[PDB]
Amino acid sequence: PIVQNLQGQMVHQAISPRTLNAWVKVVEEKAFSPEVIPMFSALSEGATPQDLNTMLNTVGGHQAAMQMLKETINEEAAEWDRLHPVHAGPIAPGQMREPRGSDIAGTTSTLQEQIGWMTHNPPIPVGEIYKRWIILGLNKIVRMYS
Numbered sequence: 001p002i003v004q005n006l007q008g009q010m011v012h013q014a015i016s017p018r019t020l021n022a023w024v025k026v027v028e029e030k031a032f033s034p035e036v037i038p039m040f041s042a043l044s045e046g047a048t049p050q051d052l053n054t055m056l057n058t059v060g061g062h063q064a065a066m067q068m069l070k071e072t073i074n075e076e077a078a079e080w081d082r083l084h085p086v087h088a089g090p091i092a093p094g095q096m097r098e099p100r101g102s103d104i105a106g107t108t109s110t111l112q113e114q115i116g117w118m119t120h121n122p123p124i125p126v127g128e129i130y131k132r133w134i135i136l137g138l139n140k141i142v143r144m145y146s
């Protein structure tokens with residue numbers, strides 16, 4: 001995630017196995033009950049899309065749920081692309097490109113690009129946006145198994 005240190009500066013750190021273990025735990029012990037959603041939110045504070053994918057990977061064992069999640073993400077990504085079509089052109093040095101749906105999902109973007117967008121002036125909070133899509137997916141999964 002991207003967190004603030006004591007020197008007021010936003011710095012990146014990899015997702016902690018402590019956090020990952022807590023996520024794996026909530027799912028493996030409660031299996032997509034409604035509780036998994038608030039837990040996912042609590043554990044994903046400041047997360048990059050990369051962090052979120054790491055979290056989702058650790059529970060890839062639940063294949064049906066994971067496919068539902070991936071498809072929800074695809075749909076949300078498409079809607080993002082419909083509403084926010086990317087400026088497909090030359091960009092001057094000092095500037096950076098705009099993210100498409102698959103960039104927000106961390107599929108076609110690097111960690112450095114993700115950090116770049118999250119800390120740009122002005123920013124695009126790609127982690128928060130992706131988290132939104134994932135939570136929509138989690139809600140679908142919770143309904144499915146309700």
Ligand SMILES: O=C(O)c1ccc(-c2ccc3c(c2)nc(-c2cn[nH]c2-c2cccc(Cl)c2)n3CCCn2ccnc2)cc1
Pocket residue numbers: 084096097098099116117118120121122123124125129
């Ligand atoms: O749902 C949300 O929470 C949500 C939804 C959308 C956005 C969003 C989307 C596109 C945005 C944006 C913010 N800020 C800018 C924006 C405005 N100036 N520069 C940028 C910018 C350029 C490159 C990389 C980054 Cl990092 C930012 N753009 C690019 C401007 C593209 N543009 C300009 C005019 N018409 C379109 C942020 C949050």
Ligand SMILES: O=C1N[C@@H](c2cccnc2)c2c1n[nH]c2-c1ccccc1
Pocket residue numbers: 053054056057060066067069070071073074105106107
């Ligand atoms: O790089 C990645 N993109 C997403 C992604 C999203 C959608 C379709 N296909 C890839 C992703 C990645 N890794 N795990 C996952 C993932 C996403 C969802 C569930 C489990 C794993």
